[PDB]
Each structure stands twice: as structure tokens, then as C-alpha cells.
Amino acid sequence: VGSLNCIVAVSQNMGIGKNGDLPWPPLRNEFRYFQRMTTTSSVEGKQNLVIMGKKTWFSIPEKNRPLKGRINLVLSRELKEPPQGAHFLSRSLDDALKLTEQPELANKVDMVWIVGGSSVYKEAMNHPGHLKLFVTRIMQDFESDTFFPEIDLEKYKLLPEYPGVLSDVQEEKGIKYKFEVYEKN
């Protein structure tokens, strides 16, 4: 089982969600970046694991659930089985990571990707050790009701670039955005 990574898209005001949806209109090519990063493994035969909260699961269009080519794990303390289509359910990120170490998953999983929401990102950021944050900066303010936490730049470094990640500004539906990668160890 490989690395632990978070991936998020965030507005200028640090917003990630509004009323259980995205604060911005759908940006298809930003979704494509997410897809590529979370699905791609260098180890043949393995899949990456995506971990998400329950609201994030239901924010994904049903036609895209489960996220194809990835093992999908939902965090909930109220559900007693995974929501229809999901592969696994855990009560906490620590328990999800424990599960990754158990025989049913330990040989299947390569990378672990935390894909939201707020509370899951916060729990991941408390994990000691190596962590990367793949942050899409949506370069406008959007009304939001759920937010990404602050990135401590005494702990994390903004990488000048990262292999396979475009540096140039992107634009879709008149909204500019860019890809960043932060690393702590």
C-alpha cells in the first residue's frame, strides 16, 4: 500500500461545497484531472483507493458511482452498510487505513486518495508522515458553506511543479483555475 494523498478543488475563499453540491458550475476538464490523478497507478494490477465522506459520495452523479477503476470507501458513523455502489464503509479515516492493511485489501490497493469533504481532509492532515495535497485553485470567489482547512506553509511546501501535472492556467465556462501540489513529511 502506497502513498497517502488528498485531492481537492477550492475557491479563492476556500470553499469546497454549497448545499451538497459544488460551489461552481461543473468543470469537466477539472473532473478529468481528478480522474487521472486518482485512478492512475504505476503498479500493474492494483487499484487506488478513494476515501470520501457520505455527502461527497452523494454529490457524485449516480452515473459516475462508484468511481470507475478505483476502490471506493465511504466514511459514515450512521450508515451500517456501504451506500449502494460503494465497495467499503468505515467509521473513521483511521479505521479505513487499518482496513487497507488487512488481507482483504492489502494486496489490492496502491495509492490512497482522500477526496473530501472538509472533515476527512482535516483528519488526513493530522496523519503523521508523508502527505501530499493536490489542490486545484479555482481563481474566483464562490458562495460556499463547507471549506478546506488552512495549509500550514511552515509544514507544507508548494512544489514548483510535479510530474504529470500541468503548470499553466486552465479555463472552462469562463472560470480560470490552476493545479498545485503541496507536500509535507
Ligand SMILES: NC(=O)C1=CN([C@@H]2O[C@H](COP(=O)(O)OP(=O)(O)OC[C@H]3O[C@@H](n4cnc5c(N)ncnc54)[C@H](OP(=O)(O)O)[C@@H]3O)[C@@H](O)[C@H]2O)C=CC1
Ligand atoms: N471541491 C472539491 O474538491 C469537493 C467538493 N465537495 C463538495 O463538498 C460537500 C461535501 O462535503 P462535506 O459537506 O464536507 O461532507 P463529507 O463528504 O465529509 O460528508 C460528511 C459526512 O460523512 C461522514 N464523515 C465525514 N467525515 C468523516 C470522518 N472523518 N470520519 C467519519 N465519518 C465522516 C459523516 O456521515 P454520517 O452523518 O453518516 O456519520 C458526515 O456527516 C458537497 O457540497 C460536495 O459537493 C466534496 C468533495 C471535494
Ligand SMILES: COc1ccc(OC)c(/C=C\c2cnc3nc(N)nc(N)c3c2C)c1
Ligand atoms: C457534478 O459532477 C461531478 C463529477 C465528479 C465529481 O467528483 C469527482 C463530483 C463531486 C465532487 C468533486 C468534484 N471535483 C473535485 N475536484 C478535485 N480536484 N478534487 C475533488 N476531490 C473533487 C470532487 C470529489 C461532481
